[PDB]
Amino acid sequence: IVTQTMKGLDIQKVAGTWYSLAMAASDISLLDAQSAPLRVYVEELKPTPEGDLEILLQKWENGECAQKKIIAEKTKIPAVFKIDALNENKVLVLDTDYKKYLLFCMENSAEPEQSLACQCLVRTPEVDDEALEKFDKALKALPMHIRLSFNPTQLEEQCHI
Ligand SMILES: C=C1CC[C@H](O)C/C1=C\C=C1/CCC[C@]2(C)[C@@H]([C@H](C)CCCC(C)C)CC[C@@H]12
Numbered sequence: 586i587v588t589q590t591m592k593g594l595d596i597q598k599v600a601g602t603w604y605s606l607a608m609a610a611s612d613i614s615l616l617d618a619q620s621a622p623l624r625v626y627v628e629e630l631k632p633t634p635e636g637d638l639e640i641l642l643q644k645w646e647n648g649e650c651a652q653k654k655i656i657a658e659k660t661k662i663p664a665v666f667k668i669d670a671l672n673e674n675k676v677l678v679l680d681t682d683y684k685k686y687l688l689f690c691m692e693n694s695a696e697p698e699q700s701l702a703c704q705c706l707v708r709t710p711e712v713d714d715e716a717l718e719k720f721d722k723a724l725k726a727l728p729m730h731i732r733l734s735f736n737p738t739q740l741e742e743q744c745h746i
């Protein structure tokens with residue numbers, strides 16, 4: 586569904602700390618409540634020397650913020666990864682300048698119209714306007730119905746408060 590992957594991606598260079606400044610999905614219910622299925626908060630990106638990609642994130646399960654460790658496997662496409670879930674879920678890196686921001690989407694390899702969720706990640710607990718500008722543009726051609734944004738204070742708390 587998304588055809589804006591980034592060219593020449595050097596995955597190793599996205600390593601470390603990241604903040605989920607904004608997020609969006611194709612369905613309200615995906616980012617609805619705090620426990621919504623795709624309501625995840627990224628903590629750090631850990632690319633293996635082997636080329637795969639470890640994801641450290643926070644998810645609000647139960648009555649608390651749970652720390653999750655997910656592994657997204659590399660594919661023949663340097664910007665696309667596959668996380669081993671009950672189904673085949675692809676992770677796509679649309680663009681990144683390595684130092685300030687990174688845009689990625691999570692797509693379900695199903696139909697009629699699979700679920701889609703994208704995020705605007707930034708390196709610092711600051712509201713980066715340009716990154717959000719780019720995030721908006723990239724979203725223009727996508728079927729989103731819910732879009733969320735967080736403030737600096739929320740970014741420093743777990744599960745964004
Ligand atoms: C796990 C939980 C726990 C939290 C939810 O309530 C239910 C759930 C399952 C369903 C999907 C299955 C596995 C892959 C998904 C799609 C997670 C995905 C690994 C995050 C994409 C990572 C990207 C952060 C870089 C987000 C929701 C997960």
Ligand SMILES: C=C1CC[C@H](O)C/C1=C\C=C1\CCC[C@]2(C)[C@@H]([C@H](C)CCCC(C)C)CC[C@@H]12
Pocket residue numbers: 609720721722723724725726727728729730731732
């Ligand atoms: C209400 C919501 C909820 C939040 C999501 O952005 C999607 C939405 C509605 C539908 C249109 C769909 C795709 C492209 C649009 C037009 C978004 C686009 C990312 C903003 C870039 C500006 C637009 C001028 C072309 C803004 C509204 C989006």
